Symmetry: none
Subunit: 71 residues, 6 copies
């Protein structure tokens, strides 16, 4: 005759760099000489003293719920 | 005649670098020479003193629930 | 005639570097020569002094629940 | 007192599809259904009945020669 | 006192599909279904009935020669 | 007092499918199902009825020669 589903729950996802301290995380010196090169097809290149990434394609949630009462 | 499902639960994910201290994580010096090279096909390259990554394609949750009452 | 499912649960996942202290983790000096090379073939290359990764494609949870009452 | 280098040589490269006959090289039927996809990072896709390629990043020549006469 | 180097030589490379007959090389029927997929990172895909490649990053020649006459 | 180096040589390379007859090499019928997949990681996929490749990163020659006459 009576029902009362009580949901007080918590769903949580904490993803990537969080709550951190980085103190003096210095990238060093970088040098890239290059002489008499040929590249007769596609190239991609990346050069850097410091790189720092949080990517996080994940971290997703789904909460799914159902009720019925039937005579 | 009566029911009261109570959910007080917690669902939690904590993913990638978190709560950390990184103190003076210095990248060292890097040097690249390169002479008279032929590349005749697809290339990719990456040169750097310090790199820091958190990736996290994961860390996800799913919470699924159902009730029924039938006469 | 009466029922009261009580769920007080915690579902927890903690993944990748966490709560750590990294103190002076300095990378080495790096030097790369290269002369008269042919790459008639696909290349991918990576050069660097210090490289810190937390990957985590995992770390996920799922929590599935059901009740029924039938006369 | 006298010299006469005679070079009547031939340097030849023949590279990729050449002198061939292709008779009725039919691509077949292709079908690509797709439903309720998510792509939450970079994609590249290729679909086709027939694909025919000559790539040839190579096939090159070099001819190097030197003389001297000295008292 | 006298010299006459004679080079009548031939240097030859013949690379990839050549002089061939391909008669009725028909690709067959292809079907792809795909339902409810998640991709959460880099993807690539290639679908096709008939594919025909000649690549040849090689096939190259080099011919190198030298003379000297010294008193 | 006199010399006459005579080179009548042939340097020859023949690489990949050549002089062949391929008669009715028909690709078979292909069908792909896929349901409810997760890809939380790097994918590369390839689907096809008939695929024909000649690759040849090699097949190259080098011919090196020298003379000298000295009093």
């Amino acid at each position: 005759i009576v029902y009362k589903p009580v949901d007080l729950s918590k769903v949580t996802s904490k993803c990537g760099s969080l709550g951190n301290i980085h103190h003096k995380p210095g990238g060093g010196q970088v040098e890239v000489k290059s002489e008499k090169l040929d590249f007769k097809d596609r190239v991609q290149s990346k050069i850097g003293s410091l790189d720092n990434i949080t990517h996080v394609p994940g971290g997703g949630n789904k909460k799914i719920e159902t009720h019925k009462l039937t005579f």
